[PDB]
Point group: D3
Chain length 306, copies 6
């Protein structure tokens, strides 16, 4: 039971493609889904081993009923919108997800071209984001991003679907959200004030202790224990993007999870707040402009089509 | 006389910023100009030595007259539109060029942000391009790009203004064009046909021999010799850019010379053709959508 | 759980293939070297980690196995079989032992080779010695990316490693080697599109030709075999270009591993003898086999207990 | 059960930190143990992938009883002095071990500063050693060091506690000894004589054939078989260190095994000898000045405090 | 065209600083080493190329010059001039010989250090041994980027190497070393804004503060000196973090190279004595000098020819 | 003003030496190649930048120079002088053109050598072809670090490049080639100390032996030469291991550049003929020269105007 490259080595370029399937285009999409792995190799092999090109393919809830006629994954539903008192997490269209990652952008682009070449006439692009990491694993806010991601075996258990849905083991659920930042408001804050928003030191990336960590900080609200006192983790690979001329500076959120319920819980706590926290302070500097949910099947599920 | 980093080592990433100066923004621009060099140091230093972060700052003909007074660079003028029978080389506004290049896209972005943060309210963005190179130094047409660029002392003599304009020694002229490719039409040709368009082999990057190479191939037309039989040369740093969603696949042309004469002859010879050739066949798969000319002064000129 | 030899090696840029016959009397010398080869590998390799990626796969032939070991024989161990095709011939040349030596540098290969041969002076006669170099973009002598469609991960393990079919020799594998000599003059007279029709993949971009344009007699068409069930049968290749410019000798060293030699043997049959659909493999019109040998490569454990 | 980073990729720098816990500093220490992995991530994450930063936390027999009640690991005991006819392996105080590794020494120091930062006023430092490895993987004596360390699965089985002590599976036993070399004496030997001392060729690092190898060579005396007939292996990460001014040229021995018996048996043969060998010839040029034993638990054990 | 020592090193990440005093009788031994020092560098360095970047700069003190060499003395060679500031002292401490060893890794420094000190045993007494390490993003012990404003290329050469104005010692340089111990506790007590105003640069972005926003008792302000004509007097520095986490030692090792010592000295006067506008350099409230020494580092030609 | 060939190449770990004689009537083809040798260098090399470090040094023999160009001859150009010593012999062998191809990868060397020879077939005859690799620690086949005392920077330019003494040929160099075969068996019967006394340096640490212990017939002793003015005379070497374990060939490929071949020949004489205090060079008791040629390597622009 072989998963896709969900658990990728640290990459520094990425392309996010989000497309909707035009009416009639179902067959063309199916043809591509079976070749996506072959196209990964076709492009990636001659740059190996330093390219680390990998494409993760996601399918939406509505798209699934169009493409496959059999069983559905148990967790697959449309992205749930969140009307918070102050902050709103929108749901935007998107039937397919192409999460492409590499050491260099051209490998991402090359593969992105191939995929879209096939899909021409069959799909409509909704979003396309060229991401780049800030050489010290920092995001647009200037804080280190991905410190707390699970690794090794914790990663496998947190992300890959298992025996709880045996027909779809090796799969994962992906949530994507495009955030825009108000760098103006943000850089108008003191470095200590920023630390209260995130819940970690800016330079040293040391976590604030519980004596000091405010309850409405990002790390406070995304820290979640389950019904059995153990931590619920997601796998994130946030990527900066933007455009100096247009004044756009963004974080592209993408979180993988064994079940959508984990990442949905965190999302609620951020947007709807909790007992002590009205919302995640990060949201006063971050507007989500997109929001979608995808199932990323096992690699052989895609292979065993055409 | 210290030049800007016009002779950069090979970089895999780049940003091209073109801006106009808003009316009454001249003073803000002058302050920035005497700082570029030190922002370059600030941003790029802690990513050394692998960073290779360099910005090159250009000034358009009109912007020069608003910014400075007195003697002007001999060959500084706005880009000369070319109206050929088939193809056109368009001129588009642009007062300042920022040619930012690093081994990493994020160093470019960090430096662009600083520069732009200090020009805010004083300039209008005209063009912004985020450029990457293919792993094998190929462009969007799949051919190796930059092989016949000059190196070392040959480049220095070809790009740097010297004694023919002593007041502006250490400077250079940069011509920029944004080109979009009709990839669909390109891939319609066979390899051999495509080779007769460029004038070099695709795979091996070997120049076609003279008794094969069309008079209308790109390499045939952009090879110009002067009256003493010397090769007239420029320094190119073509970067591919694109958006897969919008089917936009382009090459961002930038050429550096000691005088626009050189670049401009090549341009004429490409768009308007010669006695043998109607036009450069590469233009049959490439539309120029921007065109601008800048003077890239000596570094010590900016630090005043 | 038996530890196999480094059959599944990371990509390496350099290789030395060394093929010897055991001189009469030399048995016990060989028997001593076989048990020390794992050690020698580490000796030469360790001080150059992790860039070195030095490994040595040691293979034993059918007739030499009877000279060396009392006991059971690997199920599929036999002398390489000549194939007398209408047009093309696959010759069988003598070989008792294989040393497939792979590193990122020719020198690490040469130092291990020097050490192995140093221990075997006067026990063996050299049949073949090839210093191979991969091109920077993973391309072969014909200018095509070579290795694209190799199995990776669990696919590679299940494809190459012997298991329950022969429990005694679990973790073993089978190597078929062939030295090919190319007619580069003829090859370069073909157009790229013609060369594409010979291989079955696009030259520049290394995309498989689509099932509907792929000629029946292309390399890729004839080397794709399906199993009883319809599981595409797989081998693990590590072709290496080798050459002498002054002798005008442009070559590809073929080595392929499988769990059973019959998979490889099927493919050779189809290449050399042809099918109803294909006269023979078009790659043979530009390639001549000048050697052919077959070896079983036992698990590391097997070599250590001698 | 997720274990500690005992099986590290090769690193070129390391810091070894040995402390004892003062009276009443138990709680300060317990708070650290539960944060230590998150400190490792905090300092190490942004240096990835080059960084290869990691820290292994060991606890001694003494400190275990102060810090935890309940079950003790099966093999955890104080380091035992060996008083050979000639050579002495000393025992020296040490309750906590920090084995900190990276490609760069700054990362090590960064992490160590964090750890001790939290421990200020609770622990007394017994030893601090900044290690570096030579570029061709040679040690202070000039020989490639670490050639025959097990890798992959062999390493897993030799190093990690399993079914035999199931409440501590994923834990490990680390033995530590600070050696100071007599370089003058050593450099007086010819290459050939030095090889006779070690057991392997100096330049090529090829092992000497059993036909030739002395029985009091280092390789001879540290080669151990079991009743199973299987080789008994440990994992080492010996590190050069010193100061040219004080003429201190050393090797810092750290060895990991799934049980202390293996390490102790190797020590026994080196210091007390066999029938064939009076002692390990390496000791004629090497003096142990520290000696401590630690149990390095599974990570999730430290996390669950 | 005399060849200078490797005063202008590529960026190096490790360093050993050696300061020794020459014992009674040690002249002959020292003179021997000085004549062999450049070839010892090559003996240790060459087999580590090109990653090694191992180099050693050798310096001779004022009192030492006269014990070693009859004849001309470098123009600005004199003992370190102590500065007894109203508040802060810049101490002088003994030193006849300096060995500034830099490489990409520490082991390479140590090996050279062992070789040098080996030849010198009995002839010298060590005063100071510092093993230095730069942080991965060129930060010092105070968490600020350190090196940004160093000159490079033709600027550095003009700034550092002796020329026409002292023709016999053209290609030499003047090195000043001081060991600084930090009160990290005081420092880490300040806000990032506070710290930024002590240095005069932004902490994360390393952007210089604007001239009228930058305090006059700031470090950048006080060490910015214009000479006769309103051009910047430059020096070349390679400060190395060092320390010990047990003894709570956290230090900068300052070393500065100049064409003439007057430059470094003017900068020191301004730091310790102050100006009209400023009492003393604010960095000095977090930093205590514990050593102070001046050396002339001659051209390699000079050392070679004795 | 005059631009040389890449004589002063950085460190490369792979090389190909190609020696060819020019057939009767082949002169025209040869001249055409010479004018394009730079194009082909950029054609093979550019796509592999920056890592490839591909370079080609073309040299021409004395007898070949006469056939190829009328006009003045490099002052120092002449056929290699046979040295018929009492024990050892430095044989002269035919060679009209030398292609010294260096890169960080052998495959890049092969690709350029293919291009050069492709244009040359039917006009030249191969005399020698050697594929060189350097050990990871810069060691030669004798196990000694090789190249330690080679000059660098300015010093290397003074020693290598023809200057104003031959103004027409300013920027050229003289290259001497000798292919040596070693008696490894004999060499390995010596203790390290005995070997050390042959070379004149310590094996492991590569420290030059002190003048007290270093024999007068050691390799370093005999290849150290002072000119009539007391300055060391230097050559630039790039010795490359080569060989074949099958045929017991263990070699050193010797190439030495000098601004005048007189420097090199001085060294060859001392090696082969000896001095008062030395019968011959002890290295020769373990090394046999099988080839011997001398070529002039012109300025790059000399070849461009053909
Ligand atoms: C559509 C955008 C363009 C593309 C994709 C392109 C691509 C190429 C390629 C593949 C080559 C051959 C390899 C090499 O770089 O040496 C080349 C050569 C060259 N191009 Fe272009 N080019 C473009 C536009 C231009 C323009 C506008 C100019 C001048 C105004 C120019 C000047 C040159 C020159 C001077 C050469 C080298 C001539 C020689 O081989 O001696 N290019 N270009
Ligand atoms: C003359 C020497 C040979 C050359 C130059 C050569 C070259 C290639 C190339 C370029 C490919 C396509 C890229 C790839 O998938 O790796 C390929 C695929 C392959 N070759 Fe060969 N090959 C040679 C001999 C052989 C032989 C003798 C066999 C079998 C006995 C073989 C079996 C295969 C297989 C199984 C594939 C993959 C087929 C697939 O796409 O599923 N090759 N080879
Ligand atoms: C004085 C400090 C020490 C030094 C410098 C040292 C050095 C070496 C060297 C050079 C080797 C050969 C290369 C290798 O396989 O790693 C080696 C092997 C080994 N050493 Fe040591 N060693 C030291 C202390 C110890 C101690 C105290 C032990 C036992 C507790 C030990 C156990 C081993 C083992 C087990 C091997 C591998 C044996 C085998 O070949 O299977 N070492 N050591
Ligand atoms: C306590 C030890 C010291 C530390 C930690 C330190 C740190 C720094 C830092 C962070 C900078 C700004 C970034 C840079 O340009 O490198 C700097 C700049 C500088 N420091 Fe220091 N420094 C120290 C001592 C000294 C001393 C003793 C001198 C002079 C004798 C000196 C001269 C300079 C100069 C000249 C600059 C650059 C001036 C400019 O901005 O144009 N430093 N130092
Ligand atoms: C049999 C082939 C040869 C081998 C294996 C060899 C090896 C070496 C070695 C190991 C060194 C010392 C390390 C170094 O400085 O590079 C050396 C130095 C040198 N060799 Fe050779 N060599 C050979 C042939 C030659 C020949 C034929 C010449 C002269 C024609 C020569 C000239 C030199 C010179 C000038 C030095 C440096 C001497 C100095 O320290 O100033 N070598 N060689």
């Amino acid at each position: 039971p072989e998963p896709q490259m969900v658990l990728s080595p640290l990459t520094s370029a990425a392309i996010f493609l989000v497309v909707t399937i035009d009416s009639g285009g179902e067959d063309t999409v199916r043809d591509l889904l079976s070749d996506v792995a072959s196209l990964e190799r076709a492009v990636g092999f001659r740059a190996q081993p330093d390219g680390r090109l990998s494409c993760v393919t996601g399918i939406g809830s509505e798209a699934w009923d169009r493409l496959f006629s059999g069983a559905r994954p148990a967790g697959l539903h449309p992205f749930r919108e969140l009307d918070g008192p102050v902050h709103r997490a929108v749901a935007t269209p998107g039937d397919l997800l192409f999460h492409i990652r590499a050491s260099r952008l051209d490998l991402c682009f090359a593969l992105a071209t191939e995929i879209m070449g096939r899909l021409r006439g069959a799909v409509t692009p909704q979003d396309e984001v060229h991401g780049f990491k800030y050489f010290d694993e920092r995001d647009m806010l200037g804080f280190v991003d991905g410190t707390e991601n699970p690794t090794g075996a914790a990663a496998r258990r947190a992300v890959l679907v298992g025996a709880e849905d045996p027909a779809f083991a090796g799969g994962s659920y992906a949530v994507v959200q495009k955030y825009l930042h108000d760098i103006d408001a943000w850089e108008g804050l003191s470095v200590e004030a920023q630390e209260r928003v995130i819940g970690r030191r800016k330079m040293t990336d040391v976590e604030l202790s519980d004596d000091v960590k405010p309850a409405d900080s990002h790390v406070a609200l995304t820290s979640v224990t389950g019904p059995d006192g153990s931590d619920l983790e997601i796998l994130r690979d946030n990527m900066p993007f933007g455009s100096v001329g247009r004044e756009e500076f963004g974080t592209y959120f993408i979180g993988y999870a064994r079940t959508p319920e984990v990442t949905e819980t965190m999302l609620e706590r951020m947007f709807l707040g909790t007992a002590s926290a009205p919302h995640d302070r990060i949201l006063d500097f971050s507007t989500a402009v997109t929001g979608s949910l995808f199932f990323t099947p096992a690699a052989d599920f895609l292979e065993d089509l055409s």
